[PDB]
Write a protein that binds this ligand. Structure first.
Ligand SMILES: Nc1ncnc2c1ncn2[C@@H]1O[C@H](COP(=O)(O)OP(=O)(O)O)[C@@H](O)[C@H]1O
Length: 298
């Protein structure tokens, strides 16, 4: 966790998110009040969990980490709720996955802090806020939508990670990794770790473009940052479904993966980067996809 930002000042990018959260956070600390409930939404690896921890640290309260799919029976939820101290942060990742039982219980503690529960701050995280129910969603006073990071922001994150790992890196090299990070800090840091391994084995003084290219070849990451499965999704649509449109369920079954993982984990970046598009009849690949994967444009 040595690479995990401990405060907003150490959290690169997400300017709109930071200013909104900072405003609410500072104000609450100044008044000694419990912070309004916060919902963090965006694809994986963007910093939702990191922001949840930062919120508690800034408030100087304790954070209770839990997972929606974990809270099965009301007993589990009720127990966690009663363990909360005034001002504590209850962090629920994949909160939209809470069953009606534990959800209705949680909702109750939000209306009047009684199911007596100590006033606390509910911080939920989900890949997409739309997955939450109408009731629970309207209970969040602050909703922070995180989008993919820019290449410039990612480069900054990469240089920071390199420094923390005691390794020198050239700007052009950091740029190359960032361009292949699929707009995600998690990916950018893992790629940096792997590039570090290559520097180690080739005994270099610092990471350059050559070292990065060698690493990307070993990792099978192309010039667009797409990995094996990313290409597998596009190739399946192209070859089996003639480019689409293909329904999410049909596509997921052909790939042997859950539909949720496909649409919530991999599709986001592919849509953002213009390789995929969604239509009422289903997903389709774009001309950019065909060209990039060197498939004859039908
Ligand atoms: N803005 C950022 N600056 C630096 N590192 C970041 C940032 N956002 C995320 N990370 C890093 O990426 C990893 C992924 O973050 P995490 O908060 O777990 O993502 P999420 O909960 O959205 O899946 C963490 O290692 C973290 O320390």
């Amino acid at each position: 966790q040595f690479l995990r930002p401990k405060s907003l000042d150490e959290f690169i990018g997400q300017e709109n998110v930071k200013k909104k959260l900072s405003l609410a956070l500072e104000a609450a600390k100044m008044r000694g009040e419990v912070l309004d409930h916060v919902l963090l939404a965006g694809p994986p690896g963007l910093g939702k969990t990191t922001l949840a921890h930062i919120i508690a640290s800034e408030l100087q309260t304790n954070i209770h980490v839990t997972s929606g799919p974990v809270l099965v029976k009301q007993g589990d939820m009720a127990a966690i709720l009663t363990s909360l101290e005034r001002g504590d942060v209850l962090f629920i990742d994949e909160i939209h996955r809470l069953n009606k039982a534990v959800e209705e219980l949680l909702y109750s503690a939000i209306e009047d802090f009684q199911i007596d529960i100590q006033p606390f701050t509910l911080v939920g995280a989900t890949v997409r806020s739309g997955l939450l129910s109408s009731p629970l969603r309207s209970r969040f006073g602050i909703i922070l939508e995180l989008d993919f990071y820019t290449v410039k922001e990612l480069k900054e994150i990469i240089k920071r990670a390199a420094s923390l790992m005691d390794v020198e890196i050239e700007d052009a090299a950091a740029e190359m990794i960032a361009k292949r990070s699929r707009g995600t800090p998690r990916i950018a840091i893992r790629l940096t770790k792997r590039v570090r391994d290559m520097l180690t084995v080739v005994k270099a003084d610092r990471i350059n473009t050559d070292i990065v290219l060698k690493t990307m070849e070993v990792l099978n990451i192309d010039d667009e940052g797409l990995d094996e499965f990313d290409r597998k999704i596009l190739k399946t649509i192209i070859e089996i479904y003639r480019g689409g449109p293909v329904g999410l369920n049909a596509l997921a079954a052909s790939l042997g993966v859950e539909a949720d993982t496909l649409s919530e984990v991999y599709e986001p970046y592919l849509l953002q980067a213009g390789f995929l598009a969604r239509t009422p009849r289903g997903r389709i690949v774009t001309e950019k996809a065909y060209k990039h994967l060197k498939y004859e444009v039908p």
